[PDB]
Ligand binder design. Structure first.
Ligand SMILES: CNC(=O)[C@@H]1C[C@@H](O)CN1C(=O)Cc1cc(C)no1
Lengths: 104, 138, 87
């Protein structure tokens, strides 16, 4: 079963899919190929919760029911500068304008 | 030209609405005139007595947006080997058509010309889906 | 491989090259694995990227296709981007 995700760090968003049976570590290898940072320099999160490497995406709560193509699930990403991991931080998207008079 | 064949050969059909829309089944009569039939609520089915060679199409009852039936536009009841299944579903609309549907659902046609968008878009909004226009075909 | 789509407000969206090639306008803009959209904000571009995944997942599927959701607040701007990108 495919799961559809948004891997987010600061102002970066990766749109990718993975298998429910695939691991957190395997997702880190995907991030590696794109962002050129090894898995040991990466931390993955579900909201504020740090995800363990050997855990499957399904076990982490990424299911077909919740990680849909038209509404993908968010995975937080943090990088380590040296030594010391940076705090998880995701820049929010822009705010839509006020609904025009004719739409309300 | 696009019309039902008067075969007089009964064909039992099940209209299966596998869409979140209220479905309007449309029969193309012997003159090629679209004939509307009772609407189907979102997750429901209906047994209908139709005929071999008859032409059907399905639209959203409120907005007339085009729907698919057995992955195509037209459904033609065939010979009952018993009843023929007509699986009505949403097509994968383009992002543009999907946007126009949402904007049309929120804005009264008198007010399309009040939206701050390019002129070509006012014309696209006013060009509502229509069975008659779709009937070309061709 | 992957391509980068940058919003007017600096958000960088990394999507599969095949998914982005769904847009004829994007296909033309890449032909240099980064595209800047000076007029498309992130709350719109994120939805465009969800559309690419939705389209690739559900095109020629035979099963049940769900509705592509659009919040009323995003509709106008998403329409303008879809019209430009020929999405
Ligand atoms: C209740 N079933 C119907 O109304 C069906 C559906 C469509 O096939 C046209 N139709 C008719 O009876 C009209 C008709 C009679 C004969 C005989 N040939 O056509």
């Amino acid at each position: 079963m495919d799961v559809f995700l948004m891997i987010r760090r600061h102002k970066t968003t990766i749109f990718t899919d993975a298998k429910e049976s695939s691991t957190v570590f395997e997702l880190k290898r995907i991030v590696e190929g794109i962002l050129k940072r090894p898995p040991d320099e990466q931390r993955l999160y579900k909201d504020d919760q740090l995800l363990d490497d050997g855990k499957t995406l399904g076990e982490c709560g990424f299911t077909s029911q919740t990680a849909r193509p038209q509404a993908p699930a968010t995975v937080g990403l943090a990088f380590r500068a040296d030594d010391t991991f940076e705090a998880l931080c995701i820049e929010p998207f822009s705010s839509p304008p006020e609904l025009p008079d004719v739409m309300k | 030209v696009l019309r039902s064949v008067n075969s007089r050969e009964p064909s039992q059909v099940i209209f299966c609405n596998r869409s979140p829309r209220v479905v309007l089944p449309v029969w193309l009569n012997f003159d090629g005139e679209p004939q509307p039939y009772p609407t189907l609520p979102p997750g429901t089915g209906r047994r209908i007595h139709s005929y071999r060679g008859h032409l059907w199409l399905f639209r959203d009852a409120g907005t007339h947006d085009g729907l698919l039936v057995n992955q195509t536009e037209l459904f033609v009841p065939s010979l009952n080997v018993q009843p023929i299944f007509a699986n009505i579903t949403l097509p994968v609309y383009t992002l543009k058509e999907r946007c126009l549907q949402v904007v049309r659902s929120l804005v009264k046609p008198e007010n399309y010309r009040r939206l701050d968008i390019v002129r070509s878009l006012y014309e696209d909004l006013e060009d509502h889906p229509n069975v008659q226009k779709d009937l070309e075909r061709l | 491989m992957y391509v980068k789509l940058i919003s007017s407000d600096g958000h960088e969206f990394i999507v599969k090259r095949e998914h982005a090639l769904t847009s004829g306008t994007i296909k033309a803009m890449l032909s240099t694995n980064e595209v800047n959209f000076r007029e498309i904000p992130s709350h719109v571009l994120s939805k465009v990227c969800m559309y690419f995944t939705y389209k690739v997942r559900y095109t020629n599927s035979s099963t049940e296709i769900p509705e592509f959701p659009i919040a009323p607040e995003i509709a106008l701007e998403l329409l303008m981007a879809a019209n430009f990108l020929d999405c």
